[PDB]
CSV table of all heavy atoms in Angstrom, one decimal:
chain,number,residue,atom,x,y,z
O,1,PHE,N,16.8,0.4,-28.2
O,1,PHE,CA,15.9,1.2,-29.0
O,1,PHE,C,16.0,2.7,-28.6
O,1,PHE,O,15.2,3.5,-29.0
O,1,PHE,CB,14.5,0.7,-29.0
O,1,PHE,CG,14.3,-0.3,-30.1
O,1,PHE,CD1,14.7,-1.7,-29.9
O,1,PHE,CD2,13.9,0.0,-31.3
O,1,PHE,CE1,14.6,-2.6,-30.9
O,1,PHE,CE2,13.8,-0.9,-32.4
O,1,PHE,CZ,14.1,-2.2,-32.2
O,2,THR,N,17.0,3.0,-27.7
O,2,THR,CA,17.2,4.3,-27.2
O,2,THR,C,18.7,4.6,-27.4
O,2,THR,O,19.5,4.1,-26.6
O,2,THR,CB,16.8,4.5,-25.8
O,2,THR,OG1,15.3,4.2,-25.7
O,2,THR,CG2,17.1,5.8,-25.1
O,3,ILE,N,19.0,5.3,-28.5
O,3,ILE,CA,20.4,5.7,-28.8
O,3,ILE,C,20.6,7.1,-28.5
O,3,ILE,O,20.1,8.0,-29.2
O,3,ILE,CB,20.6,5.4,-30.3
O,3,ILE,CG1,20.4,3.9,-30.6
O,3,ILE,CG2,22.1,5.8,-30.7
O,3,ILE,CD1,19.9,3.7,-32.0
O,4,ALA,N,21.3,7.4,-27.4
O,4,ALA,CA,21.5,8.7,-26.8
O,4,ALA,C,22.5,9.6,-27.6
O,4,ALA,O,23.6,10.0,-27.0
O,4,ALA,CB,21.9,8.6,-25.4
O,5,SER,N,22.2,9.9,-28.8
O,5,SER,CA,23.1,10.7,-29.7
O,5,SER,C,23.4,12.1,-29.1
O,5,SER,O,24.6,12.6,-29.2
O,5,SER,CB,22.4,10.9,-31.0
O,5,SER,OG,21.0,11.4,-30.8
O,6,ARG,N,22.5,12.7,-28.5
O,6,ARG,CA,22.7,14.1,-28.1
O,6,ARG,C,23.5,14.2,-26.8
O,6,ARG,O,24.4,15.1,-26.6
O,6,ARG,CB,21.3,14.8,-27.9
O,6,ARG,CG,21.5,16.3,-27.4
O,6,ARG,CD,22.3,17.1,-28.4
O,6,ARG,NE,22.7,18.4,-27.8
O,6,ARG,CZ,23.8,19.1,-28.3
O,6,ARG,NH1,24.5,18.7,-29.3
O,6,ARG,NH2,24.1,20.2,-27.6
O,7,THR,N,23.2,13.3,-25.8
O,7,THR,CA,23.8,13.4,-24.5
O,7,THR,C,25.1,12.5,-24.3
O,7,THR,O,25.8,12.6,-23.3
O,7,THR,CB,22.8,13.2,-23.4
O,7,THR,OG1,22.0,12.0,-23.6
O,7,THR,CG2,21.8,14.4,-23.4
O,8,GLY,N,25.3,11.6,-25.3
O,8,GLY,CA,26.6,10.9,-25.3
O,8,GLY,C,26.7,9.5,-24.7
O,8,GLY,O,27.7,8.8,-24.7
O,9,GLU,N,25.6,9.0,-24.2
O,9,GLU,CA,25.6,7.7,-23.6
O,9,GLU,C,25.5,6.6,-24.6
O,9,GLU,O,25.6,5.4,-24.3
O,9,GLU,CB,24.5,7.5,-22.5
O,9,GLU,CG,24.5,8.5,-21.4
O,9,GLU,CD,23.8,9.8,-21.6
O,9,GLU,OE1,23.4,10.0,-22.8
O,9,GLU,OE2,23.7,10.6,-20.7
O,10,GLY,N,25.3,6.9,-25.9
O,10,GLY,CA,25.3,5.9,-26.9
O,10,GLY,C,24.2,4.9,-26.9
O,10,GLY,O,23.0,5.3,-26.6
O,11,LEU,N,24.4,3.6,-27.1
O,11,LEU,CA,23.4,2.7,-27.1
O,11,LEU,C,23.0,2.3,-25.7
O,11,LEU,O,23.8,1.6,-25.0
O,11,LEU,CB,23.7,1.4,-27.9
O,11,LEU,CG,23.7,1.5,-29.5
O,11,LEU,CD1,24.8,2.4,-29.9
O,11,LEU,CD2,23.6,0.2,-30.2
O,12,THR,N,21.9,2.8,-25.2
O,12,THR,CA,21.6,2.7,-23.8
O,12,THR,C,21.3,1.2,-23.4
O,12,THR,O,20.7,0.5,-24.2
O,12,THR,CB,20.5,3.6,-23.3
O,12,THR,OG1,19.2,3.2,-24.0
O,12,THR,CG2,20.8,5.1,-23.7
O,13,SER,N,21.6,0.9,-22.1
O,13,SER,CA,21.3,-0.4,-21.6
O,13,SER,C,21.2,-0.2,-20.0
O,13,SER,O,21.3,0.9,-19.5
O,13,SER,CB,22.4,-1.4,-21.9
O,13,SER,OG,23.7,-1.0,-21.4
O,14,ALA,N,21.0,-1.3,-19.3
O,14,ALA,CA,20.9,-1.2,-17.9
O,14,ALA,C,21.9,-0.3,-17.2
O,14,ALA,O,21.5,0.5,-16.3
O,14,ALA,CB,20.9,-2.6,-17.3
O,15,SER,N,23.2,-0.5,-17.5
O,15,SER,CA,24.2,0.3,-16.9
O,15,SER,C,24.1,1.8,-17.0
O,15,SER,O,24.5,2.5,-16.2
O,15,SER,CB,25.6,-0.2,-17.4
O,15,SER,OG,25.8,0.0,-18.8
O,16,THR,N,23.4,2.2,-18.1
O,16,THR,CA,23.2,3.6,-18.4
O,16,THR,C,22.4,4.2,-17.3
O,16,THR,O,22.6,5.4,-16.9
O,16,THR,CB,22.5,3.8,-19.7
O,16,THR,OG1,23.2,3.1,-20.8
O,16,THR,CG2,22.4,5.3,-20.1
O,17,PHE,N,21.4,3.5,-16.8
O,17,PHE,CA,20.4,4.0,-15.9
O,17,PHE,C,20.7,3.7,-14.5
O,17,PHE,O,19.8,3.4,-13.7
O,17,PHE,CB,19.0,3.3,-16.3
O,17,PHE,CG,18.7,3.5,-17.8
O,17,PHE,CD1,18.5,2.4,-18.6
O,17,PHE,CD2,18.6,4.7,-18.3
O,17,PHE,CE1,18.2,2.5,-19.9
O,17,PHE,CE2,18.2,4.9,-19.7
O,17,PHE,CZ,18.1,3.8,-20.5
O,18,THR,N,21.9,3.9,-14.1
O,18,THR,CA,22.4,3.7,-12.7
O,18,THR,C,23.3,4.8,-12.3
O,18,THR,O,23.9,5.5,-13.1
O,18,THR,CB,23.1,2.3,-12.6
O,18,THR,OG1,24.3,2.3,-13.4
O,18,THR,CG2,22.2,1.2,-12.9
O,19,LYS,N,23.4,5.0,-11.0
O,19,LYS,CA,24.3,5.9,-10.3
O,19,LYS,C,25.5,5.2,-9.8
O,19,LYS,O,25.4,4.1,-9.3
O,19,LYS,CB,23.6,6.6,-9.1
O,19,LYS,CG,22.3,7.2,-9.5
O,19,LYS,CD,21.8,8.1,-8.3
O,19,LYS,CE,22.6,9.5,-8.3
O,19,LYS,NZ,22.2,10.3,-7.1
O,20,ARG,N,26.7,5.8,-10.0
O,20,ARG,CA,28.0,5.1,-9.6
O,20,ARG,C,28.3,5.4,-8.2
O,20,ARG,O,28.1,6.5,-7.7
O,20,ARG,CB,29.1,5.6,-10.5
O,20,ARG,CG,28.8,5.4,-12.0
O,20,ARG,CD,29.1,4.0,-12.4
O,20,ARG,NE,28.9,3.7,-13.8
O,20,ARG,CZ,27.6,3.6,-14.3
O,20,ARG,NH1,26.6,3.6,-13.5
O,20,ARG,NH2,27.4,3.3,-15.6
O,21,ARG,N,28.7,4.4,-7.5
O,21,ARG,CA,28.9,4.4,-6.0
O,21,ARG,C,30.3,3.8,-5.7
O,21,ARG,O,30.5,2.7,-6.0
O,21,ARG,CB,27.9,3.6,-5.3
O,21,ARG,CG,26.4,4.1,-5.4
O,21,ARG,CD,25.5,3.4,-4.5
O,21,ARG,NE,25.9,3.6,-3.1
O,21,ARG,CZ,25.6,2.9,-2.1
O,21,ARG,NH1,24.7,1.9,-2.2
O,21,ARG,NH2,26.1,3.1,-0.9
O,22,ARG,N,31.2,4.6,-5.1
O,22,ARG,CA,32.5,4.2,-4.7
O,22,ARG,C,32.5,3.8,-3.2
O,22,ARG,O,32.0,4.6,-2.4
O,22,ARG,CB,33.6,5.2,-4.9
O,22,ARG,CG,35.0,4.7,-4.6
O,22,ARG,CD,36.1,5.7,-4.7
O,22,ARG,NE,36.5,6.0,-6.1
O,22,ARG,CZ,37.6,6.6,-6.5
O,22,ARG,NH1,38.5,7.0,-5.6
O,22,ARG,NH2,37.7,6.8,-7.8
O,23,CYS,N,33.0,2.6,-2.9
O,23,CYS,CA,33.0,2.2,-1.5
O,23,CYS,C,34.4,1.8,-1.1
O,23,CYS,O,35.0,0.9,-1.7
O,23,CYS,CB,32.1,1.0,-1.3
O,23,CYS,SG,31.6,0.6,0.3
O,24,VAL,N,35.0,2.5,-0.1
O,24,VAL,CA,36.4,2.4,0.2
O,24,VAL,C,36.5,1.6,1.6
O,24,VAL,O,36.2,2.2,2.6
O,24,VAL,CB,37.1,3.7,0.3
O,24,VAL,CG1,38.6,3.6,0.6
O,24,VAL,CG2,36.9,4.5,-1.0
O,25,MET,N,36.9,0.4,1.5
O,25,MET,CA,37.2,-0.4,2.7
O,25,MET,C,38.7,-0.2,3.0
O,25,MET,O,39.6,-0.8,2.4
O,25,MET,CB,36.9,-1.9,2.5
O,25,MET,CG,37.2,-2.8,3.7
O,25,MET,SD,35.9,-2.6,5.0
O,25,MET,CE,34.5,-3.4,4.2
């Protein structure tokens, strides 16, 4: 019910509301 037309995230879901973290072993 939150379609992010202006900012480009599209049809928002759980993944939208997270920060990406890279972990290099």
Side-chain angles (χ1 to χ4, degrees):
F1 275 84
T2 298
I3 301 148
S5 51
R6 180 62 196 152
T7 52
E9 299 88 353
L11 282 73
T12 65
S13 62
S15 63
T16 310
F17 308 118
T18 62
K19 304 193 81 182
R20 305 280 179 282
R21 301 189 58 201
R22 182 185 287 195
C23 200
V24 182
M25 181 77 68

